[PDB]
Amino acid sequence: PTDTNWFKHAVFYEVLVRAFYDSNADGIGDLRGLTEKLDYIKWLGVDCLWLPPFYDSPLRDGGYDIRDFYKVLPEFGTVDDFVTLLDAAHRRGIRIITDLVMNHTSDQHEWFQESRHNPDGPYGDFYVWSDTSDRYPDARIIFVDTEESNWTFDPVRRQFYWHRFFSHQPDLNYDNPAVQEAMLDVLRFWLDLGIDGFRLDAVPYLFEREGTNCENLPETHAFLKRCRKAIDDEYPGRVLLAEANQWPADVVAYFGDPDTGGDECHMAFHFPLMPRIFMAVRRESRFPISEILAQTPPIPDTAQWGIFLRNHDELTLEMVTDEERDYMYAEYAKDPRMKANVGIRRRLAPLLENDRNQIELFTALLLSLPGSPVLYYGDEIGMGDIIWLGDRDSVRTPMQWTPDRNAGFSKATPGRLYLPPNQDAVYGYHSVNVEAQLDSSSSLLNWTRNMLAVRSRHDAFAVGTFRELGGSNPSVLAYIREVTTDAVLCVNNLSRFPQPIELNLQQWAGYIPVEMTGYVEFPSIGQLPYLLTLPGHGFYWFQLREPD
Amino acid sequence: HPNAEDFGHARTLPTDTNWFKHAVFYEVLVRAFYDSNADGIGDLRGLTEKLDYIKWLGVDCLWLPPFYDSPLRDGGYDIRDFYKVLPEFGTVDDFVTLLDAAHRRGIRIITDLVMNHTSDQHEWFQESRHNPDGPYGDFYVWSDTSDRYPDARIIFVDTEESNWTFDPVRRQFYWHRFFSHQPDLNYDNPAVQEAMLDVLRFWLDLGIDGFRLDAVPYLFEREGTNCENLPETHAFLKRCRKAIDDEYPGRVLLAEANQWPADVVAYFGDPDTGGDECHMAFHFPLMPRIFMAVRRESRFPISEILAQTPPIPDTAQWGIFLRNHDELTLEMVTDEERDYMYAEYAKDPRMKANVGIRRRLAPLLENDRNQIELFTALLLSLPGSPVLYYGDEIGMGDIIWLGDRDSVRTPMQWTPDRNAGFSKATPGRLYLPPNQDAVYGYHSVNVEAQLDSSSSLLNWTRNMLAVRSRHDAFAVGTFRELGGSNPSVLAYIREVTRQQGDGGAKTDAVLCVNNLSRFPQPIELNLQQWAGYIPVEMTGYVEFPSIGQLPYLLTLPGHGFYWFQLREPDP
Ligand SMILES: C[C@H]1O[C@H](O[C@H]2[C@H](O)[C@@H](O)[C@@H](O[C@H]3[C@H](O)[C@@H](O)[C@@H](O)O[C@@H]3CO)O[C@@H]2CO)[C@H](O)[C@@H](O)[C@@H]1N[C@H]1C=C(CO)[C@@H](O)[C@H](O)[C@H]1O
Ligand SMILES: [Ca+2]
Ligand SMILES: [Ca+2]
Ligand SMILES: [Cl-]
Ligand SMILES: [Cl-]
Ligand SMILES: [Cl-]
Ligand SMILES: [Cl-]
Ligand SMILES: [Cl-]
Ligand SMILES: [Cl-]
Ligand SMILES: [Cl-]
Ligand SMILES: [Mg+2]
Ligand SMILES: [Mg+2]
């Protein structure tokens, strides 16, 4: 049932098929397992699942190296299990989007094997081949510590092929019109199955051109317009999300032509948000947050920013920044917490040293700042990570359902699990798990669920305007979200100590602030500045109720 | 009996007749704190080694439950020799060494002393029953029948069939308010009175800073009375206070009288002399009332017991603590006639389940950190001298199956090492085991783990004690409850009467605001008398807007609290 704005009102939940629930005791999470846990997901109150790549893959780069776009990784199930999942989610009002890597395939993909073995055949030009490694010299090597070059010599074809990512991930040749059609057909295949949309990954790198750094080319945007057009024409109500790990000013291009109301991606991610919030709290100053928001350009009214509490892009493990436009550019390296975690994904609780007050503060900001928020699976119970598993796999350990064997994720033997659960005294499944948190109304899980329920009752959080209120105290960030008569006031203390703030709310004189969890009515707003007092790292949400 | 001279003595601190009013006490069991000799049992030498932690924490006086020689049938409240420490704990010499080391750091020590009764293994009782016409013949209360004092209740009614027990050797009944193995001393025998004063003098000569006198309401019995709170009992307490003040100025007597506050006031003595009995007594109903105030999200249960608490002598001070039960009898104080919450405790399922069992703070509050902070804030800011129980500062749990008292007497959890770092002995030799569950176990909850993060409960508690220590109003200030629009919020101001050295933050008034609701609450306060003053929040030192003629609006998160110094305005 089409609702062309659903993505603006959605809370997304990024969940890995491999990690959520193993229904068949092979030690690996699967589609049937995820289907069996949909009642939990509905109960939590999220609106759309975001599944990282689950296609057939040799898994040398986390499944971002795809061997077959048309096939589910066999240990997850088949496309039939995927449709079962889709139907069960839809039946509960939950949508599903997935990652789709557009720039490159695994070298195990049959297209590449045909390209190298049969250069004269129909796949001969499906990839970017050269007698020399000299072309495109201005393109940086993304994985500079691992790849000596963006060109690799193939021993079968005896020419170099191009890859922006690892050598086992050859780039598709988008100047070949058969490649463009083949990739459009991949989109249609999953859309026909009923998927609600895609996050398109690595799209800034589609086209290469001499004289350029081979990112963000106009031909790249042109292909994205084809994708959007195919969606608009054939599957209305579906969504395209861009993964462009760039400064927000540069990302706005990915929404497309403003005069059209946006003709490329419906959404794109605002990557610098979490690094700025993290630094605002470290510095006890609202300015890193105020500034990043104020400097973010307007986007088409059809579009929406995606936001999440992570410091790194999951594809490249890089944190966005900009020498010229980021006033905090040199500051990140001066923070020992940021410095220790460079290039490693970490979960929310570990990022905040398990401080429950800060977890709540960061989560409140995620749920009230402009954009559609993405929650990462397990953050709602305060799961930890295991950094030694890898820069990405750190945060991909099994969902911790119960304090039972394997955290209740699987009936297999522990040695057969795809990755082990946390076992330490702080984050281990004996103390951190869904079951333990279900009872108390004061658990992080129940708190998170309640915050989602509150957010869902106020359209202002999803699509409202954003007005930062300033105020006497630079340690406090206060703002109003407004839709036109749903008006909400959010006040956030970035300081570890109690703070007073006096706000000029004269425009809303007469209005009565009603705090959104206890529904207590606060003193009516007058002509004098309104005094609010917050504990360290505290926050309040108020509905601004019109007078009688 | 040993003769004091035969031992060393601790060096005395400069006498300070009001030290106990400013003190935060720390109740710590010798058996539980630290085992220095790998026998699985905490000891005096071990406690001495841990004085550095105690000093760092910032408490002013240790309160040690009984450590005398005892067969330990009733937790050591059954004393076999008043002049001897239980051998597993060490000797009198070790106690003197502990006292000296504590005194070096400015830390005092008091101990429990049971006045009403001894173990039946005490030699006085063995002599009393074997040799009736000897000098101990009337040291206890003997009778040919079990008919005397019928109006006295049986305290342990589910265990003891009578307050009289027939002795097989003497063939007469002897009286005991507590268990049958704890015969009552006969205070009508002046030799008993002198013997007990001699016990006090023994420990005072060694250098102890005072005593909590246990079971004192039950000293004397008289026909036609319920045998509690008799005039002769109070008269004996005046002797103890007289001996204390004449011979050892600057020491303290605390009364353990588990009674309604209007009734325990008598234990401070004659108000006309400024108080001539105990310097201190416990305000037992405070925690049950705070507990109820939070359960009902209303300030009134707290407001009311405070308002109904009668004034006490100028030299005197209430003791307060976050427990619902007296450790001696495991009873919660109540009063059918005078407690308006009398029937309400039995309606609360948490209160109900824990009847007669000591529980630690974190377990009482289901490990809710915000509530632990709220209750701790109240303990540290309400009138009285507070007692912290060892381990509550790190959020230790308890083990209820160990017994109604032993639940809270498990080893101090120092580290996540073997035996929680309490001992090098094998685990099977520990006097009691540490908590081992996922919530409160020593792998998760221990001092070492909390020392690092400035956001741990330990560091928070230590900072709160530091803040309290720098503001006299918390210790000896007046108490002015402020009312307010919102019944869910308890607000009060505490003030020092000046003199000598005037201002400074140390003597400025303090404002405390406490949210008993689990939801954010506004409160508007009429603080017009403090117009112009600037509230400065005590932990972060942020200046809040100056007080004016309008009501002052403060907003609190669920279960939150603020402490403010009221600073006088610039001229
Ligand atoms: C997020 C919020 O969680 C908690 O709030 C909940 C309660 O503690 C539960 O008892 C439950 O309350 C209700 C009764 O059970 C039900 O009978 C109903 O009719 O009355 C209640 C409905 O108000 O549910 C509560 C939420 O509805 C925790 O207590 C609370 O303080 C936490 N609050 C924060 C959220 C916001 C955003 O509005 C901020 O304003 C706050 O400062 C946060 O602290
Ligand atoms: Ca490319
Ligand atoms: Ca007696
Ligand atoms: Cl996966
Ligand atoms: Cl398939
Ligand atoms: Cl990402
Ligand atoms: Cl991250
Ligand atoms: Cl002991
Ligand atoms: Cl007690
Ligand atoms: Cl208790
Ligand atoms: Mg499986
Ligand atoms: Mg020992």
d(CA B491, CA B306): 13
Domain A464-548 in CATH 3.40.50.300: no
Q: Chain B interface, mutation test: which of A337, A361, A451, A533, most B Cβ atoms within 10 Å?
A: A533
Sole residue written with tokens 């598993």: A389
d(CA A239, CA B158): 72
Other beta carbons within 10 angstroms of residue A265's beta carbon come to 28
Given CB atoms, is B531 within the 8 Å cutoff of chain A?
Answer: no
Q: Which residues, at least 6 apart from B180, have a Cβ–Cβ distance to it below 8 Å?
A: B120, B160, B165
Q: Which of B552, B365, B388, B384 is nearest to B465 (CA)?
A: B388
Q: Which residues, at least 6 apart from B4, have a Cβ–Cβ distance to it below 8 Å?
A: B201, B202, B205, B206
Contacts 24+ apart (CB under 8 A), A66-71: A66/A101, A66/A105, A66/A106, A66/A109, A67/A105, A67/A106, A67/A108, A67/A109, A68/A109, A68/A110, A69/A100, A69/A105, A69/A186, A69/A189, A70/A186, A70/A189
DSSP state of B185: B
State which H helix or E strand residue B523 sits in.
strand B521-525
What is the distance in A from the centroid of ligand 8 to the CA of B228?
A: 28
d(CA B260, CA B264): 6
3-class DSSP assignment, residue A483: strand
Residue B256 annotated among the catalytic residues of the structure: yes
**Residue A426 with chain B: CB contacts under 8 Å:** 444
d(CA B554, CA A341): 39
Given CB atoms, is B182 within the 8 Å cutoff of chain A?
Answer: no
Q: In B445-518, which ranges are E strands? A: 480-481, 489-494, 509-515
- This structure was determined by X-ray
Instruction: Quote the tokens at residue A163.
Output: 């890859």
Instruction: Quote the tokens at residue B117.
Output: 């009764």
**Nearest residue of B to residue A442, measured between CA atoms:** B368
Exposed/middle/buried for A473, CB within 10 Å: 0-12, 13-18, 19+? buried
| Ligand 1 lining (C-beta closer than 6 Å) | A 441, 447, 450-451, 454, 515-519, 539-541; B 518-520, 557-558
**Residue B464 with chain A: CB contacts under 8 Å:** none
Candidates B438, B520, B553; nearest CB to A431: B438
d(CA B164, CA B221): 13
**Residue B555 with chain A: CB contacts under 8 Å:** 522, 532-534, 540
State which H helix or E strand residue B468 sits in.
helix B457-469
Exposed/middle/buried for B223, CB within 10 Å: 0-12, 13-18, 19+? exposed
Buried b (16+ CB within 10 A) or exposed e, B176-198: bbbbbbbbbbbbebeebbebbbe
Q: How far is B298 from chain A (nearest CA, A)?
A: 15
CA atoms in the 13 A half-sphere facing the CB of B211: 27
The residue annotated as part of the active site, out of B88, B256, B398, B508, is B256
Please judge whether A518 and B521 are an interchain contact, meaning their C-beta atoms are less than 8 angstroms apart: yes
Q: Which of B37, B57, B2, B18 is nearest to B461 (CA)?
A: B57
3-class DSSP assignment, residue B85: strand
* φ, ψ at B231 (rounded to 5°): -50, -45
d(CA A176, CA A123): 10
d(CA B347, CA B349): 6
Residue type, B54: I
d(CA B130, CA B313): 46
3-class DSSP assignment, residue A514: strand
Instruction: Quote the tokens at residue B169.
Output: 């050797």
Domain A1-103+174-463 classification at class level: alpha beta
The ranges assigned to domains in chain A are 1-103+174-463, 104-173, 464-548
Please judge whether A403 and B517 are an interchain contact, meaning their C-beta atoms are less than 8 angstroms apart: no
Please judge whether B553 and A538 are an interchain contact, meaning their C-beta atoms are less than 8 angstroms apart: no
Given CB atoms, is A495 within the 8 Å cutoff of chain B?
Answer: yes
Exposed/middle/buried for A83, CB within 10 Å: 0-12, 13-18, 19+? middle
Candidates A356, A403, A520; nearest CB to B438: A403
Other beta carbons within 10 angstroms of residue B31's beta carbon come to 23
Please judge whether A518 and B522 are an interchain contact, meaning their C-beta atoms are less than 8 angstroms apart: no
**Residue B513 with chain A: CB contacts under 8 Å:** none
Given CB atoms, is B557 within the 8 Å cutoff of chain A?
Answer: yes
Q: Which of A232, A98, A123, A100 is nearest to A176 (CA)?
A: A123
Candidates B443, B455, B542; nearest CB to A498: B542
State which H helix or E strand residue B459 sits in.
helix B457-469
Interrupted backbone of chain A, residues before each interruption (C–N > 2.5 Å): 484
d(CA A136, CA A338): 33
The residue annotated as part of the active site, out of B69, B209, B214, B339, is B214
d(CA B327, CA B65): 10
Which residue, judged by its Cα, is nearest atom 21 of ligand 1?
A: A518
Which residue, judged by its Cα, is nearest atom 32 of ligand 1?
A: A517
Q: Report, as residue numbers or ranges, the catalytic residues of A.
A: 201, 243
d(CA A299, CA A305): 9
d(CA A389, CA A407): 18
For Cα atoms B485, B489, B495, give the angle at the middle one, nearest 5 degrees. 95
Sheet with B561-567: strands ordered across: B480-481, B489-494, B509-515, B561-567, B534-537
DSSP sequence for B288-353: HHHHHHHHHT-SHHHHHHHHHSPP--TT-EEEEES-SS-TTT------TTT-TTTTTGGG-HHHHH
Sign of CA pseudo-dihedral A442, A445, A446, A447: positive
d(CA B37, CA B425): 8
* φ, ψ at A18 (rounded to 5°): -65, -25
DSSP sequence for B127-162: HHHH-TTSTTTTSB-EESSS-S-TTS--TTTTT-S-
Exposed/middle/buried for A415, CB within 10 Å: 0-12, 13-18, 19+? exposed
d(CA A389, CA A397): 9
Sole residue written with tokens 């193995």: B181
Domain A104-173: give its CATH code: 3.90.400.10
For Cα atoms B305, B310, B312, give the angle at the middle one, nearest 5 degrees. 125
Given CB atoms, is A439 within the 8 Å cutoff of chain B?
Answer: no
Instruction: Quote the tokens at residue B208.
Output: 């102890």
Q: Residues of B within the annotated binding site? A: 74, 116-117, 182, 184, 212, 218-219, 221, 325-326
Instruction: Quote the tokens at residue B487.
Output: 């019944």
Instruction: Quote the tokens at residue A412.
Output: 């297999």
For Cα atoms A163, A168, A170, give the angle at the middle one, nearest 5 degrees. 35
d(CA A231, CA A218): 20
Candidates A497, A522, A532; nearest CB to B542: A497
d(CA B162, CA A542): 63
d(CA B393, CA B464): 11
Give, rounded to a whole angstrom, the gap between the first and last alpha carbons of chain B: 67
Radius of gyration, CA atoms only, chain A: 24
Q: In B86-138, which ranges are E strands? A: 108-114
Domain B1-116+187-476 in CATH 3.40.50.720: no
Residue B94 annotated among the catalytic residues of the structure: no
Q: How far is A240 from chain B (nearest CA, A)?
A: 40
Other beta carbons within 10 angstroms of residue A233's beta carbon come to 8
Exposed/middle/buried for B355, CB within 10 Å: 0-12, 13-18, 19+? middle
* Spatial contact of A159 and A134, defined as CB atoms under 8 Å apart: no
Given CB atoms, is B518 within the 8 Å cutoff of chain A?
Answer: yes
**Residue A536 with chain B: CB contacts under 8 Å:** 539-540
Sole residue written with tokens 């890193």: A288
Q: How far is B484 from chain A (nearest CA, A)?
A: 14
**Residue B562 with chain A: CB contacts under 8 Å:** 498, 533, 535
Given CB atoms, is B156 within the 8 Å cutoff of chain A?
Answer: no
Q: How far is A36 from chain B (nearest CA, A)?
A: 28
Please judge whether A495 and B540 are an interchain contact, meaning their C-beta atoms are less than 8 angstroms apart: yes
Q: In B144-235, which ranges are E strands? A: 164-166, 173-175, 210-214
* φ, ψ at B158 (rounded to 5°): -85, -5
Other beta carbons within 10 angstroms of residue A345's beta carbon come to 22
**Nearest residue of B to residue A443, measured between CA atoms:** B368
DSSP state of B559: T
d(CA A284, CA A108): 50
DSSP state of A38: H
Please judge whether A536 and B540 are an interchain contact, meaning their C-beta atoms are less than 8 angstroms apart: yes
Instruction: Quote the tokens at residue B475.
Output: 């210790």
Other beta carbons within 10 angstroms of residue A405's beta carbon come to 14
DSSP sequence for A286-306: SHHHHHHHHTSPP--TT-EEE
Give, rounded to a whole angstrom, the gap between the first and last alpha carbons of chain A: 38
CATH number of this structure's domain B477-571, picked from the four choices 3.30.70.3460, 3.40.190.10, 2.60.40.1180, 3.40.640.10: 2.60.40.1180
DSSP state of A172: B
For Cα atoms B84, B87, B91, give the angle at the middle one, nearest 5 degrees. 60
Q: How far is A500 from chain B (nearest CA, A)?
A: 6
* φ, ψ at B86 (rounded to 5°): -55, 125
Ligand at shortest distance from the CA of A193: 5
Buried b (16+ CB within 10 A) or exposed e, B480-494: eebbbebbbbbbbbb
Given CB atoms, is A502 within the 8 Å cutoff of chain B?
Answer: yes
Given CB atoms, is A541 within the 8 Å cutoff of chain B?
Answer: no
* Spatial contact of B514 and B374, defined as CB atoms under 8 Å apart: yes
d(CA A492, CA A504): 16
3-class DSSP assignment, residue A431: coil
d(CA B407, CA B326): 14
Instruction: Quote the tokens at residue B253.
Output: 């007597």
Which residue, judged by its Cα, is nearest atom 12 of ligand 1?
A: A518
Given CB atoms, is A425 within the 8 Å cutoff of chain B?
Answer: yes
Instruction: Quote the tokens at residue B306.
Output: 């405070």
Sole residue written with tokens 């050295």: B501
Please judge whether A515 and B519 are an interchain contact, meaning their C-beta atoms are less than 8 angstroms apart: yes
Residue type, A531: L
Instruction: Quote the tokens at residue A148.
Output: 């000596």
* φ, ψ at B25 (rounded to 5°): -95, 155
**Nearest residue of A to residue B520, measured between CA atoms:** A518
For Cα atoms A426, B451, A357, give the angle at the middle one, nearest 5 degrees. 55
The CATH superfamily label for domain B117-186 reads Oligo-1,6-glucosidase; Domain 2 (3.90.400.10)
Alpha carbon A159 to its chain's center: 37
Candidates A428, A517, A538; nearest CB to B519: A517
**Residue A430 with chain B: CB contacts under 8 Å:** 438
Q: Which of B513, B562, B559, B515 is nearest to B538 (CA)?
A: B562
Site to probe by mutation for ligand 1, drawn from A367, A450, A492, A543 as the one with most ligand atoms within 8 Å of Cβ, is A450
Given CB atoms, is A517 within the 8 Å cutoff of chain B?
Answer: yes
**Residue A500 with chain B: CB contacts under 8 Å:** 542, 544-545
Which residue, judged by its Cα, is nearest atom 23 of ligand 1?
A: A518
d(CA B182, CA B87): 21
Q: Which of B385, B376, B377, B323 is nearest to B354 (CA)?
A: B323
d(CA A186, CA A192): 10
3-class DSSP assignment, residue A311: coil
CA distances from A462 to A142, A482, A488, A508 (A): 35, 10, 11, 21
Q: Which of A144, A254, A247 is nearest to A204 (CA)?
A: A254
* Spatial contact of B257 and B282, defined as CB atoms under 8 Å apart: yes
Q: Which of B153, B220, B211 is nearest to B185 (CA)?
A: B220
How many beta-carbon contacts under 8 Å exist across A and B?
77
DSSP state of A75: G
